[PDB]
Symmetry: C3
Subunit: 205 residues, 3 copies
Amino acid sequence: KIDSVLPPLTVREASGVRTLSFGYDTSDFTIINSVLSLRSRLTLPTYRYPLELDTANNRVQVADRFGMRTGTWTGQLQYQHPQLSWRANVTLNLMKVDDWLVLSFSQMTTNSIMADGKFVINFVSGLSSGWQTGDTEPSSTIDPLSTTFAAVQFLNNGQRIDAFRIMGVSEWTDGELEIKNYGGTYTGHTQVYWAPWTIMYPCNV
Amino acid sequence: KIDSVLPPLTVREASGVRTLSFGYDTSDFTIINSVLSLRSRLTLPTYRYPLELDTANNRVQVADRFGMRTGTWTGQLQYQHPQLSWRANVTLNLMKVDDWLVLSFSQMTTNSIMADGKFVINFVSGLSSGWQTGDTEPSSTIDPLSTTFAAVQFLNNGQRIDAFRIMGVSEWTDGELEIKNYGGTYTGHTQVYWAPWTIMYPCNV
Amino acid sequence: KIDSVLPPLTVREASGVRTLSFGYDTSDFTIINSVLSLRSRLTLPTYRYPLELDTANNRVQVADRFGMRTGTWTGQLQYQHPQLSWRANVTLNLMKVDDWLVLSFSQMTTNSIMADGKFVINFVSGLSSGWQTGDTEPSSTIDPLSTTFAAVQFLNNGQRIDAFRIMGVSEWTDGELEIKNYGGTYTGHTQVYWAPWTIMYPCNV
Ligand SMILES: CC(=O)N[C@H]1[C@H]([C@H](O)[C@H](O)CO)O[C@@](O[C@H]2[C@@H](O)[C@@H](CO)O[C@@H](O[C@H]3[C@H](O)[C@@H](O)[C@H](O)O[C@@H]3CO)[C@@H]2O)(C(=O)O)C[C@@H]1O
Ligand SMILES: CC(=O)N[C@H]1[C@H]([C@H](O)[C@H](O)CO)O[C@@](O[C@H]2[C@@H](O)[C@@H](CO)O[C@@H](O[C@H]3[C@H](O)[C@@H](O)[C@H](O)O[C@@H]3CO)[C@@H]2O)(C(=O)O)C[C@@H]1O
Ligand SMILES: CC(=O)N[C@H]1[C@H]([C@H](O)[C@H](O)CO)O[C@@](O[C@@H]2[C@@H](O)[C@H](O)O[C@H](CO)[C@@H]2O)(C(=O)O)C[C@@H]1O
């Protein structure tokens, strides 16, 4: 039947007995259970967010949402001072940009404030869909995480007086974000007009 | 002749017939068009920017430009108010840091301004090489995207008066960036000296 | 002995002699030194920081420290002006967030200052463990890299006068960071109370 044999196939006549064998690369293959098997089958790694595998085009990429994720918080902005405290209905815009959380305040009119004080935002409830309270937790306990200025107008018996307020992100406790108002320029007033302002802090959730 | 046969190769006599055959692992291989073929050939993924494959060292990395990309815009800064509007020749420095665009203003001397108003930057033309107009488009329509303060000196005509201006990134339309000046401290003046200032906004291009 | 063969094996006959041969997918395999060898052995890429391979779960991810790395600098904050200069003992908090370096100043009381001037931070020494001087080098030479406002109180014979100071990150030279105080509101004073403030600049180290 079989006259000759071509590689990988070879016939070795050792001890007057002709034996047929299959030749293979030792580092590539191995015989297990009397079959040709691959030595070291390479398993492809998985990817943790913000890295993702686009299975449709077999491409690894940074998730789009990582650069920008929007949301809103609806609740009551709490002003706190031992001698004066109030609640104002606000809706603030939120945006996750990389490892930062940005809060955007639109203009607002509030009751009067003391020379210094605290603003508290309770994220326990009020977040738009897709957002969890934990998503607003800062990635550091350093105080302050960031400071910004808010431009205001103090209303005092008809006259509008331009001033500023310095605001610092200082604490986060069980979903309550605390923004300290260290001070700034001040005058006796009845009401405050706040121009829009943004504040951001590190957040890796 | 052929006396013996070593694995993967095996001989089986069944139904008075002796048939030789090649022994293979069924999860590693198969037979396609009567030849040994690999089952499940693993294809290596490609990478979308800012991820890149350094082919020279077979290493996946984040592109260097992602952390920092510089540029300049040369044009006319437009101040807009219904009762007053002007154009000033400026060159502002630009830097792309991750998913942020930073605009850096050098000191400047401009005509007088109203208590509030708009600054417009037309990116349709004026960008340095490598930059396209689309590269300045914000990644969100939230208003404001960011706010900052600019320190100014109002020339009363006899005296130089220190004040501030609050600036907010508010809109981008077909290459025109709009920076609103909500207000701040103010006095009657002939001209404005602006100290340097920076403003940044989210941008994922 | 051997009655017949089966695929991959074939016994083809030509030119008067019958020969046994092994069949293979020519794209998948080849013969090298008369042995079955695979073509195109896939080599897995390595990863450059902030990308890393979690070997335990065979997963590629962004390093945790990339989003947040804390530290402290302890030294003397140097104020510089041709007609006045001093040194104050400070400890400032530092945080690396992505490609940004954030400096956090706690409240401080310093000696009096001129209408404008420079603040210098010498990172050559004073950094907490894990931090090198090179880690504070900006990723661009643009001036200013960033500006912020500091809220101050000018102390002049017991009276406290609220004002602001504009601060810009302007230069880094051999470990010395320079923060220019372009100006802001001012009055004659003997000492300055500074509210807390943060400033950040691009840094890809
Ligand atoms: C940060 C923020 O949420 N800013 C709002 C603020 C604050 O909610 C508020 O001033 C804090 O004290 O209010 C602004 O005006 C809105 C406010 O007056 C509410 C009160 O009901 O009405 C909104 O519009 C109403 C309108 O009053 C109705 O007559 C109408 O039928 O429906 C509208 C629904 O929107 C005001 O826009 C403010 O500028 O003071 C808007 C800020 O965005
Ligand atoms: C943001 C920005 O671009 N700031 C510039 C500003 C503004 O261009 C300007 O003040 C807006 O009104 O100008 C600063 O000064 C430059 C300005 O006066 C221009 C006017 O020609 O000249 C520049 O230097 C010239 C110099 O005037 C010529 O005599 C000389 O032959 O060439 C020089 C270089 O072209 C001024 O630097 C300003 O300080 O207000 C500089 C800002 O960076
Ligand atoms: C940024 C910083 O390090 N801030 C410190 C600050 C400065 O060290 C200092 O005021 C610069 O002049 O000091 C603070 O605390 C002070 C002590 O450092 C000082 O030894 O004693 C002071 C009272 O006698 C004061 O308590 C401050 O000014 O509050 C603390 C701050 O974090």
